[PDB]
């Protein structure tokens, strides 16, 4: 069995690639996005426990061993996963294949396969071994499908356009090969006998042929543009729609730019499928027709032209890898410089304050020098490639003219025939050049296709649920939690065994120490996530049995870190609910005290706002959030004062709103400050992911629990 | 096996590596 | 006097460009960065008051007039500054030049010059007129210098390399023109008489000539790369160093990306000057030598080749503008899409919560369709340009072969002479093509050169000050403020008349309502800014007379929004002060309680920190800030609890540090929460940029002022 | 002049490149 290495599509997924690589090595090909979901790859990174759990889930018998400096012991079956350190900067996971006498074979998912000297690797690695072995439950299979053929589906409806492009290209080629015989007719016939009338006619004939050729080129160029855009739009929009349908777990796992890189990826995959469809259709025939014509003209000169193509092929194929290696190394060194410049600019207050203007400059200079060195090495490789292609092309041209003249002198072919042959090389070399210059595009394309298709194969949020919505129409009732444990990924559980009881139409407060566990307990109640151990009952009915649509439509969640999308204030206020009458919006708007700042706007309701409400102050912003919430007319209203200032000008307006609710609807407040919640009915204290004590303020203070100590620590 | 074994916490302590890229 | 329009180099500077444009129109050319500094262009935008003040400062007699729908009235000075609205989205400033019978000439600094119909403009504009007129004090001048000649200075030390590149290029051309006569010698001499020995010799001769030519190309290519990198490095580093030496005012005015855009265009400046210098040196001679050789060969065919170049010149020059217009329009429509995608992705919690998955998709699709439409229009213009260049080139080739054969038949030139002429076109058209394809690069280069050079001409922070440091060596003493007014730009003053008194070695607290004015009053004390009205006295000596170096080195400022640069913890802790012994660092480290989390880092002290201490906890990051501060061993320690959570686990460690200070050094705390500051000596209340009441807690509560109401509002 | 005058505040209210 040959060594297999899985490449990193994202930056954070290191261990996922290693487990996938070993999984492939033993003969089980699985989608890397699914293994990413299994291992629980957070934005921080992958825990070895996460890898062991994911392995144990696949049926691999595996254990996490502390690295021993003596790893030369025979009975340590490979392949094994050992976490190295990349140049004393970040922790990294790498796959060990075979520890030889002194050389260690390591199929680094960051960069292909590499072999280190025992002493070197032993200096690099932390040492944290994960030993895996298949134990009956493991079964060989192929669960990934070829996504390149899946994305070919969008070429099915555009058959006419493809065929029209193919005919246009074919007829362009035919007029090209026909038009290239002008010099022959010129030198052999017309100039020899000195015919004028014929020359004047033939000149116009070839001129008209060329005018029809450039017209077909123009028509083809328009159709290939339209086809390209159409497939590009189709793929981009198909991907975007699928992402939105995925659960919050997907969005917690990955970063923002990590998701949008897929759009640029989508732009690159389209190019490859379009190129593959056209090039193969119009060049594999064009090259053959050209080659046949040349082989008919003269054998010797054709076999010289074949050698020119062969040598060009070899030079490009041998130079293809180092250029991509240098390119990657430049993009790394450039990314560090731009990161350093942003970091240096963001905190100039500090640099100025410490008078460190010299050191930061010296640091930046060293990072520029590094980029220049990397740039120069890539430049040198391009110059070397350019020069050698230059040599081949030029000597090819001269030696063909030499051999041609020799064959003409010997009386094998006529004079003009050589110039016609020299003309036809344009229609023989160009196709095969274009055909050879496609392999790097296809390789980076298949990468992109897999990178994108793996995300398109993920199970949407709607499909993960089965409901019984006709059985319970209303929400309104007592909300309770039973043994509700929760963990974000495969790390320490945020919430352990929890028991709650929220009676209908009472302002219940959840206070605590950890903001994460507090905000998590809200985000859980809406059923964004699902707790592994325990369950949550609304009105004596499991949330898992209620409609997702109704749940999210009937529950309002007011976070202090509110988001505002760039639009019109009026439209922005009632987003997601169209056919809403202004008469409601203005009634709701009053409750938040929108008007007061809304009237000072140029347009009352149609004022345009800056990205993330840049022109809007925090105090006004939240009122837009409350106005959004109260418009919903929900059964549960979940407030948040988490990661807040609490200026005490908004608290009055929150009280004005909470009084303004005027229904038997439940209000859940999550404010760390005890001064705000004293008036609430039941105050629940979240301590280390456990509800310790519950009840009214007076009772909790009277009992003298943890709440008493916190309240005495307050004032 | 024949190696120094670790607890489930120390497995949770070991972390994976990011890398730099275009943005 | 012809109409003059100043272009926007940055996004925010609209009014600055309009005032500069009118200033130029009357005949006073001033650097736009200086006018930006005069008008006080904040990150938000330019206030009309700012423009009027800036105008009044230049000596222009000007007034702000509320727009009247009837603006067809004669006796209003033209031109005037009227603020329009761009498609009901953002507020924009535009320059009115001539209000004709119904057409209004408006030289839009966003996009060149445009003319609107009275009714249209009248619908677009808010209407806010600023009427300007020179009133004696105004004087015509030219205060900007040509920065393109300033940046040519970096080409002075690299004379040898330029001259070596020039000789290599000249000798390449010479061997090129010599090597292009092979086909003549082949068709005329060798093939006619059927000489073999001579053919075999001449073939090798031309082969060796080509091998020397490609070798000179290789050598030139290496030298032009080295020269390019060298000038690029020089300009980039020269700019970076100058930016750091500028005062905080410069960094408050502009954004981050706004500063690094100069770094990205430093490349295109260098690229343009370098390319333009070499092109003129090696092509203006190459084209002439080629042209002379052709004019010697045959006059008719040379004048045909001249027409081909002329027509190519006309087609490129007429198509140059619309392509750039389409390009700008694409970059706009693309920037909106990517912004919309980021906005949509950042708040998927909200979209999911509201079930607005359909609307956001429909919105995105409309933005993709817009980008596709813009892309298609630019594609169409490129296809049109490509096609017409195609027609000219091809018909040029055919008609030259036609005329050639005709001239050969008539017995004006020999056969091979035509093929030699066809070969020499390669060395005549290429230079003049390259020479004509330089005008767009030069124009965008001169823009960049001015954009960069304007920043390089700004007065550095050190030059704006005169000191007397030998008169006062120490800082330690009573800090007082006298009538200290302050305004960020030309807007409402943040601080009005202020009087303070901070006695040496007492923990004085500044509490208030506005966080901006509070943090501003600290940033002022360090002398980042300078107050217009009033002054600040340390130890009975004006801060303006003390050394900048000593001031910033002797004062520590601990902000809650602390910045951490990616490096080693140990190095990061003592940034700006090298030759610092670890024995101090570890003593300081203890005072912050660094150790407790420092010991648990993988490497004790050489842990590589993630970007802005992402891996490190907020609490952990603060302790590093205090450790950084206490390492300085300052005379004034300025704390901040502004835009904070105040978890109450850090307060203990702040008290541990403040007790650990153990000197007669002043501590200034700025905490909005009254519970923390009660123990302080003198509590100063900042109300609407005014100190209302000052003294001890007990006295302030006993007096029953604004503090009493705030304290009763607390608890 | 011959136009409707403005206050130094409303001169401070007019903005360019803002909303």
Residue numbers in the entry:
A (entry chain A), C (entry chain B): 8 to 722
B (entry chain C): 8 to 30
D (entry chain D): 8 to 26
Show passages lifted from the paper.
To obtain a stable PCAT1-CtA complex, we used a proteolytic-deficient mutant (C21A) that can bind but does not cleave the substrate. Next, we determined the cryo-EM structure of the PCAT1(C21A)-CtA complex in the presence of excess CtA and in the absence of ATP. The overall resolution is approximately 3.4 Å. Consistent with the native MS analysis, two copies of CtA were bound to a single PCAT1 transporter. In this ATP-free, substrate-bound conformation, the TM cavity is continuous with the cytosol and closed off to the extracellular space. The two PEP domains, each binding a CtA molecule, interact with the transporter core at the TMD/NBD interface. Residues 8–25 of the leader peptide form a L-shaped structure that wraps around the PEP domain, with the N-terminus in the cytosol and the C-terminal end at the lateral opening of the translocation pathway. The double-glycine motif (G23 and G24), inserted to the active site of PEP, interacts with catalytic residues C21A and H99. For the other substrate, the non-translocating CtA, no density is observed beyond S26, two residues beyond the double glycine motif. Comparing the structures of PCAT1 in the presence and absence of CtA shows that in the substrate-bound conformation, the intracellular opening of the TM cavity (formed from TM3 and TM4) is approximately 3 Å wider and the two NBDs are further apart.
